Amino acid sequence: MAKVQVNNVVVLDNPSPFYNPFQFEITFECIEDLSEDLEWKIIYVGSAESEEYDQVLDSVLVGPVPAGRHMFVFQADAPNPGLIPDADAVGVTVVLITCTYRGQEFIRVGYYVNNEYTETELRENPPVKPDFSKLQRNILASNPRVTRFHINWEDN
C-alpha cells in the first residue's frame, strides 16, 4: 500500500565544519503514483539536553510524485546555532528526515552527527561557549536509525 519506499539513503559532504550543509542523497522508489505532494523534511535535534529545541530546516516537496525510483539531493544549511545547547553542541546530535504524506509521516531517518572541534586543543578543553566555527560535523551515515511508521497512504 506504500506509495513511496526509500531504498538508498546516504549522507554526503560529511565530515566538514558545522557551517556545512545537510547534504543527503535520497533514493526513493515510488511504488504507486502520487496525487498529493510528498513533503520531505529535515527536522534536526536542537538540544539533546532538551529535545523540544528541535528545528526543521528545509522541506523538499514533489507535487506530484510519479511511480519510479527517484534519486534527489536534499540540502539544508546549518541549524539555528542559538538552539544548539552548550553541553550538547560539543557532542552528538541527530538529524531526522521525516516524510509527511497526507499529514502523516511514514518514515523518520535518524542520522547521528557527531560534533567535535577540529582544533585538537579545543577537543581537550571545550570552552564554556562552544565554537561552532571550529566544530566538525561527522555525520555517521553508517549508523542509520530507520524508524518507519505504518500509516494509511490510501485515504480510507
UniProtKB/Swiss-Prot annotation:
Q: In which tissues is it expressed?
A: Ubiquitously expressed.
| Spans through the membrane | none
The known PTMs are summarized as: Phosphorylated by TLK1 and TLK2. Highly phosphorylated in S-phase and at lower levels in M-phase.
Q: Which GO terms describe its biological process?
A: DNA repair; DNA repair-dependent chromatin remodeling; DNA replication-dependent chromatin assembly; muscle cell differentiation; nucleosome assembly; osteoblast differentiation; replication fork processing
- Location of this chain's protein in the cell: Nucleus; Chromosome
Q: Give, from the UniProt record, the effect of changing E49A.
A: Loss of interaction with TLK2
Record annotation: effect of changing D37A: Abrogates interaction with CHAF1B and HIRA
The record's GO CC annotations read:
chromatin; nucleoplasm; nucleus; protein-containing complex; site of double-strand break
**GO MF annotation terms:** chromatin binding; histone binding; histone chaperone activity
**Free-text function comment from the UniProt entry:** Histone chaperone that facilitates histone deposition and histone exchange and removal during nucleosome assembly and disassembly. Cooperates with chromatin assembly factor 1 (CAF-1) to promote replication-dependent chromatin assembly and with HIRA to promote replication-independent chromatin assembly. Promotes homologous recombination-mediated repair of double-strand breaks (DSBs) at stalled or collapsed replication forks: acts by mediating histone replacement at DSBs, leading to recruitment of the MMS22L-TONSL complex and subsequent loading of RAD51.
Q: How does it assemble?
A: Interacts with histone H3 (via C-terminus), including histone H3.1, H3.2 and H3.3, and histone H4; the interaction with H3 is direct. Probably interacts with the heterodimeric form of H3-H4 taking the place of the second dimer. Interacts with the CHAF1A, CHAF1B and RBBP4 subunits of the CAF-1 complex. Interacts with CABIN1, HAT1, HIRA, NASP, TAF1 and UBN1. Found in a soluble complex with NASP and histones H3 and H4; the interaction with NASP is probably indirect and mediated by H3-H4. Interacts with CDAN1. Found in a cytosolic complex with IPO4 and histones H3 and H4. Interacts with CREBBP.
Please give the family membership noted in the entry: Belongs to the ASF1 family.
Q: What's this protein's name?
A: Histone chaperone ASF1A
Instruction: Report which gene this protein is encoded by.
Output: ASF1A
Question: What is the covered span of the full protein?
Answer: 1 to 156 of 204
